């Protein structure tokens, strides 16, 4: 047997029904071993060190790489040095796009302040009762779920002024 | 682009006031939002595709005119080593 | 209060001013939208206020008393507030059984956010505000009460025994003019 | 029915809630104007079947 | 309906729709709302002025 | 009326106007809403309870 | 006179129509705003005039 391209858009699709769940998280405040090459990350890991806060992920939906003229006068996004137009679930199967886009960001002093070197998208996500707010720290979290596509980086820094944008695509 | 070290990094400013909700030409579902603190004029909010220090800001402070509210947005996609697309 | 900060609601009745006169091209306010739905219900109650009295009941609201003094009351309308609300709240309120004691209706005011309820987020479907934060909702519901003056009397009862019935709809300003 | 695709209108009686309250700096949607004129028209509706019935001459 | 408004970026564009709503006569449909009765031909009751059924059963 | 967010003159500050009713007393305008009537600085007809119209006209 | 150039409100009774249908990705005409409300009045009116007169003290 083999897999389908109707199975990974199912999948695409079921990464969009546990949408409502997703969380965007940052970690790792101390330094690297060595900060001006960070290491490469463990795929058995359960969850960032040094988690710094949870952030509710802003945008998922489905995506395809973008060409004319049926994308040119329509919405379009930006991303690795490529153009993406988005595609609803309930059309997705007929326009093929398997392609999963997720982003959040991490407005202002809405987590704590400080330099972070992680950056992953969980899901499965629940905090304590009566916690609606979106913006979430480590202790005010019930459920941390599963550690969904993660990696790391060189570390940055952060400040009221500064908005921190993360968002990734995903081939299912 | 002259305090960071060279001219291919993508850095744009965005201007909200251009999104503001007008009542005819501005569509209903449409990308412009209603006009408040943020989608004001006299606001802008700097897009900048890499690592850079938060004194960066006080350079924009030397640069930006008087009287103009400033944010700074940092694109974690850009800084993303080799290919950002993940496989399964 | 609604001319707070979030809500920035204009709408003030001395002002005698009955309509919004929108223009074209130029910045939609928040605050027109409030205040246009502001003098509509205010004027709505008004017209309520004119006739009907905060504690009439129109149909239903048949009460049940359990040997415990145990009251519920079943649903109904009933005018509270400027509007005919439709009661359906499954209260079990318990009176002490002696002296003079009096049920009530009382209605706090809440705010619902798209944070608290994730259905009044935008479910436009392939638009570029999807999902998109908007408009919160003000929800007021009814609950029983014994022996507040606050609250709008429904019924009074005289040691555990009813006081005073009323097979149909209670009209006050109309009772007025009839006696 | 307007709760459908084309208008999405979010009225209910059930759910208690009598004002659509705007925010600053957020997108508008039709649908809370729909629900806005909703509102109005139901409890004018319940106003008048508290006094008249339909078919009620005038 | 086309917004009709001398120059502006949405002048002939489309809009909100309407909802109309317009009354016909019926005889003999129980989900009309009756307005008269009548018997072999003959009206069967009569009512001089507004008639109101809530404020006629307090009445009665 | 202007936009209270910013709260100052100008380009996007207009926005929306007001109608108002500002009610004026009369003495003999036919136009104007009778509320009461005299003959010779004398009360004509007096009504110690709310007034209408259509419930008056069922009840006589 | 709301008929005019300035609103162009296009409310009259004899149409019969009683709502406004927002549809998404239009433009938001302020004559619609105003007949939104303009109904909505019309027909409170309707119901204060089936039982009350002008004039009428309370």
Request: hydrophobic share 35%; no cysteine.
């Amino acid at each position: 047997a083999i897999a389908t391209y109707n199975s990974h858009v199912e999948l695409a699709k079921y990464l969009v029904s546990k949408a409502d769940s997703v969380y965007l998280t940052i970690g790792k405040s101390t330094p690297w071993s060595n900060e001006t090459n960070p290491p490469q990350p463990d795929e058995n890991a359960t969850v960032l060190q040094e988690v710094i806060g949870y952030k509710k992920a802003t945008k998922v939906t489905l995506v395809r790489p973008s060409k004319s003229p049926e994308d040119d006068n329509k919405n379009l996004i930006s991303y690795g040095n490529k153009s993406w137009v988005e595609v609803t679930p309930e059309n997705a199967k007929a326009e093929g796009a398997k392609w999963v886009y997720l982003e959040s960001s991490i407005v202002g002093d809405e987590l704590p302040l400080g330099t972070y070197r992680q950056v992953g998208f969980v899901m499965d996500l629940v905090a304590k009762s009566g916690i609606s707010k979106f913006n979430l720290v480590p202790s005010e979290v019930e459920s941390t779920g599963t550690l969904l596509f993660f990696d790391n980086k060189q570390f940055q820094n952060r400040s009221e002024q500064t908005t921190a944008k993360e968002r990734f695509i995903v081939e299912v | 682009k002259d305090y960071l070290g060279r001219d291919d990094i993508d850095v744009s400013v965005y201007e909200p006031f251009t999104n503001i909700f007008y009542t005819n030409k501005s569509h209903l579902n449409g990308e412009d939002h209603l006009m408040g603190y943020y989608y004001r004029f006299a606001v802008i909010n700097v897009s900048i595709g890499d690592y850079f220090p938060v004194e960066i800001i006080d350079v924009i402070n030397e640069f930006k005119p008087a009287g103009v509210t400033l944010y700074v947005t940092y694109d974690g996609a850009s800084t993303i080593r080799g290919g950002a697309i993940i496989k399964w | 209060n609604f001319k707070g900060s979030p809500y920035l609601d204009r709408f003030d009745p001395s002002k005698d001013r009955t309509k919004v006169l929108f223009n074209p091209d130029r910045p939609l306010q928040q605050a027109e939208l409030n205040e246009m739905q502001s003098i509509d219900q205010y004027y709505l109650k008004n017209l309520g206020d004119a006739i009907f009295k905060d504690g009439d009941k129109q149909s239903g609201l048949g009460f049940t008393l359990s040997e415990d003094n145990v009251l519920t009351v079943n649903p109904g309308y009933v005018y509270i507030n400027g509007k005919i609300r439709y009661y359906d709240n499954d209260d079990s309120v318990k009176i002490t059984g002696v002296g003079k004691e009096t049920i009530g209706i009382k209605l706090t005011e809440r705010i619902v956010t798209p944070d608290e309820d994730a259905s009044l987020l935008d479910q436009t479907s392939g638009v570029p505000s999807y999902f998109s934060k908007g408009a919160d909702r003000l929800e007021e519901k009814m609950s029983l009460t014994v022996n507040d003056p606050t609250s709008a009397t429904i019924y009074t009862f005289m040691d555990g025994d009813l006081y005073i019935q009323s097979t149909n709809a209670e009209m006050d300003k109309i009772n007025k003019v009839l006696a």
